[PDB]
């Protein structure tokens, strides 16, 4: 998945979102480099700012940012926050450039 970051600090996803190549809603997620089976999602925002999300998981395997709506996998939560913000700074738009 172009999105999914692997051995990526919080400093180093924001580091790696603010440089040139990325713009608003720019996103990737990456897991807890301290805490294992714990995802965040980090987008770009506009001075310019990285936002994190925590994404909290359900015992049966799936994932949610608000209890207003889960989701059965990563794919689906990215695709859902694509289509709109719905609550997050702003709509995603393109996988973190490198
Ligand atoms: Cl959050």
Redesign the pocket.
């Given at each position: 998945e172009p999105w999914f970051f692997k051995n990526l600090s919080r400093k180093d996803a924001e580091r790696q979102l603010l440089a040139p190549g990325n713009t608003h809603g720019s996103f990737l997620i990456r897991e807890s480099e301290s805490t294992a089976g714990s995802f965040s999602l980090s987008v770009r925002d506009f001075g310019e700012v990285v936002k994190?999300?925590?994404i909290r998981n359900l015992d049966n395997g799936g994932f949610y940012?608000s209890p207003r709506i889960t989701f059965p996998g990563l794919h689906e939560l990215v695709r859902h926050y694509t289509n709109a913000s719905d609550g997050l700074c702003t709509r995603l738009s393109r996988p973190c450039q490198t």
């Amino acid at each position: 998945e172009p999105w999914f970051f692997k051995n990526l600090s919080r400093k180093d996803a924001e580091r790696q979102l603010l440089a040139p190549g990325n713009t608003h809603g720019s996103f990737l997620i990456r897991e807890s480099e301290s805490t294992a089976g714990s995802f965040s999602l980090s987008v770009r925002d506009f001075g310019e700012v990285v936002k994190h999300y925590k994404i909290r998981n359900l015992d049966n395997g799936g994932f949610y940012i608000s209890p207003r709506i889960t989701f059965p996998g990563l794919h689906e939560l990215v695709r859902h926050y694509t289509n709109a913000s719905d609550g997050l700074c702003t709509r995603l738009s393109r996988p973190c450039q490198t």
